[PDB]
């Protein structure tokens, strides 16, 4: 529709073609100050296809739902509470070397109690101490009054 090529035929053997365009460009990388190595991520592309493109990387491949992550052992057993190097879809990497640990920001405390009306009554973990805490917040209300001579 928008003038985009699809395929051709040969005038010799009269067989057709589908010209899917090729791929170029890298994806991303990850770095930390106290680390010294690099964490490489190659999303939306197969690890075996990446290794068949040029050569075999020094770090072993790790294929994920996102893609091919390098130099990081995937570890979904533990969950990082607060990350700063976001891989996307709740995923992150960190240095102690570099390894891949799934990320969740928040969780529910999961109080070990009942669920139903025991004798028509409920087990609620009500507070017994009185404690307050101040809260810090800022709202920007003003901007510097810039000008320019045209």
């Amino acid at each position: 529709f928008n003038g985009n090529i699809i395929g051709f035929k040969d005038f010799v053997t009269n067989k057709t073609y589908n010209i899917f365009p090729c791929y170029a460009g890298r994806v991303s990388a990850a770095f930390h100050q106290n680390a010294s190595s690099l964490a490489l991520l190659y999303r939306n592309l197969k690890c075996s296809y990446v290794l068949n493109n040029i050569s075999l990387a020094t770090q072993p491949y790790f294929d994920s739902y996102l893609g091919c992550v390098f130099n990081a052992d995937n570890l979904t057993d533990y969950s990082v509470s607060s990350c700063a190097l976001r891989m996307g879809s709740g995923f992150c990497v960190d240095y102690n070397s570099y390894r891949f640990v799934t990320f969740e920001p928040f969780n529910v405390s999961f109080v070990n109690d009942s669920i139903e009306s025991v004798g028509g009554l409920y087990e609620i973990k009500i507070p017994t101490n009185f404690t307050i805490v101040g809260q810090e917040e800022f709202i920007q209300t003003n901007s510097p009054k810039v000008t320019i001579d045209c």
């Binding site: 090729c22 791929y23 170029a24 460009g25 890298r26 994806v27 991303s28 990388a29 990850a30 770095f31 930390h32 100050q33 690099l38 490489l40 493109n53 700063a84 190097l85 976001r86 891989m87």
Partner: protein, 111 residues
């Protein structure tokens, strides 16, 4: 032409407009008796590495001396760090687009 016997970075000597493209380099033989002295003394150690078009980083200190240099062409840590104006970049997920496959052999448009 550049040399610096003292100080590990090199400095300017002179420029020389020729126009003729320079093509070949050779080291002369020195007809000398024994600089090695039955391989018990020193020898000659000219080492060579070619140059080409690259963009680098030139870090200056308070006294205007070249502190460090970054290739920005070999590794992936060669880039990012030098494009973030530091010897050591901050944490972040920085994208890369420094690779193109270019495996082609035939380019024609014909009737």
């Amino acid at each position: 032409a550049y040399y610096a016997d003292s100080g590990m970075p090199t400095t300017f000597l002179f420029s020389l407009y020729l126009g003729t493209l320079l093509s070949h380099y050779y080291v002369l033989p020195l007809t000398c008796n024994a600089i090695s002295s039955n391989t018990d003394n020193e020898t000659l150690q000219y080492w060579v590495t070619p140059l080409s078009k690259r963009q680098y980083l030139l870090k200056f200190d308070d006294r205007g001396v070249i502190t460090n240099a970054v290739d920005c062409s070999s590794s992936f840590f060669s880039e990012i760090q030098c494009k973030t104006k530091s010897l050591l970049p901050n944490t972040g997920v920085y994208d890369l687009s420094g690779f193109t496959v270019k495996p082609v052999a035939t380019v024609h448009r014909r009737i």
